[PDB]
């Protein structure tokens, strides 16, 4: 099918006989010359020490949220560690984690009971998902957990969770208020009693508990992926840039095939990618040195194969549509 | 005043559906002759035009 303009038709017609006429094959397309990978340059490693090795994870009811920025994803370094009992990525397929730089990255770290790591995922409900921590339905990120039972256990009563709350949380909402919970009609007046419960009940953890009660350390990342100015990048080197030639580009994880050209388009400081009527990305801003590149796809213009019947003669004459005769 | 011919159009269905992308273009082959029976319809127009 790729041999030459004639045989491009026979595959279309699904026939080895091509009758006398004119046939328009697919628009002639230029294969991408070489690959381009352009990421912002920073040498830093994300605090995988201060997130995953942190000495004290906060309780689930008040969970810490640590913005990660201006670092390269060290993801290969986690491999010597307690590893992970569950690693579940909702937005991204975990293979692409290296190829793809991130934007707003917040590690949300807390310690929950063994049975309840299930409950952290969009759509789940239960004591964790309803009351003391909640994930959006559109959530994009990963959920990482590994047992701390060799550390967090002694009985360790410090880790603590909110058992009673009037209603369910909104996504990523934190309520640390300790005000007493009123089961019946009578006001509690700030003291425990009949139909009055102190809402925060502490986990017990012994070192000997079953896998249900062994504390897991959950760390829930979040990110927007595309559409936003990149900060946290992947462990992938950046290459040289090529202008005005058909290339295979990777800009801040956005990939495709285009002809990178200069442009006068002016992005406001917070804008990164431009988009078209067809929403295919028209213009990007070179991350290393900030300037606006127009992405024009390769493969413009139609082809038409003029042929007498292959039964008669095997010669063809190709018609390229609206090109003065130079390029091809 | 009467119309006579209408603008002759032709669509490239491989290119419109999966733009210049290999991983996608392979998938469009499973759907098969959809692509190839459009251009048989838009040609029958452009011939009688």
């Amino acid at each position: 099918c790729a041999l030459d303009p004639l045989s491009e038709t026979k595959c279309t017609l699904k026939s080895f006989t091509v009758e006398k006429g004119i046939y328009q094959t697919s628009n002639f397309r230029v294969q991408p010359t070489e690959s381009i990978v352009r990421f912002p340059n920073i040498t830093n490693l994300c605090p995988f020490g201060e997130v995953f090795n942190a000495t004290r994870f906060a309780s689930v009811y008040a969970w810490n949220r640590k913005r990660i920025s201006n670092c390269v994803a060290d993801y290969s370094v986690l491999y010597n560690s307690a590893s992970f009992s569950t690693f579940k990525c909702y937005g991204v397929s975990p293979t692409k984690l290296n190829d793809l730089c991130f934007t707003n990255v917040y590690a949300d770290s807390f310690v929950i009971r063994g049975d309840e790591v299930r409950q952290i995922a969009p759509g789940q409900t239960g004591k964790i998902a309803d009351y003391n921590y909640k994930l959006p339905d559109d959530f994009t990120g990963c959920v990482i957990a590994w047992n701390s039972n060799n550390l967090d256990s002694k009985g360790n009563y410090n880790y603590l969770y909110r058992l009673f709350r009037k209603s369910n949380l909104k996504p990523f909402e934190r309520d640390i208020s300790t005000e007493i919970y009123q089961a019946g009609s009578t006001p509690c007046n700030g003291v425990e009693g009949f139909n009055c419960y102190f809402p925060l009940q502490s986990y017990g953890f012994q070192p000997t508990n079953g896998v249900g009660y062994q504390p897991y350390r959950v760390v829930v990342l979040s990110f927007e992926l595309l559409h936003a100015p990149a900060t946290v990048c992947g462990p992938k080197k950046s290459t040289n840039l090529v202008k005005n030639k058909c290339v295979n580009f990777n800009f801040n994880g956005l990939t495709g095939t285009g002809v990178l050209t200069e442009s006068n388009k002016k992005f406001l400081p917070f804008q990164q990618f431009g988009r078209d009527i067809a929403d295919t990305t028209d213009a990007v801003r070179d991350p290393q040195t900030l300037e606006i590149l127009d992405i024009t796809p390769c493969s413009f213009g139609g082809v038409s194969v003029i042929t007498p019947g292959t039964n008669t003669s095997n010669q063809v004459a190709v018609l390229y549509q609206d090109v003065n005769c130079t390029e091809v | 005043i009467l119309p006579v011919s209408m603008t002759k159009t032709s669509v490239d269905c491989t290119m419109y559906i999966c733009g210049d992308s290999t991983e996608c273009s392979n998938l469009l082959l499973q759907y098969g002759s959809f692509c190839t029976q459009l251009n048989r319809a838009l040609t029958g127009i452009a011939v009688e035009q």
């Binding site: 328009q24 628009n27 078209d276 009527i277 067809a278 024009t296 796809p297 413009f300 213009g301 139609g302 549509q321 | 011919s5 603008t7 002759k8 159009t9 032709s10 669509v11 490239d12 269905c13 491989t14 290119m15 419109y16 733009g19 452009a46 035009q49």
Partner: peptide
């Protein structure tokens, strides 16, 4: 011809092309 009358640059990039009519506006 004065009464009857980018846009086509974003049509050929996707595939929606316009073939020329066989008979020119001159031959007609």
């Amino acid at each position: 011809f004065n009464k009857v009358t980018a846009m086509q640059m974003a049509y050929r990039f996707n595939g929606l092309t316009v073939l020329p009519p066989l008979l020119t506006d001159e031959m007609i």
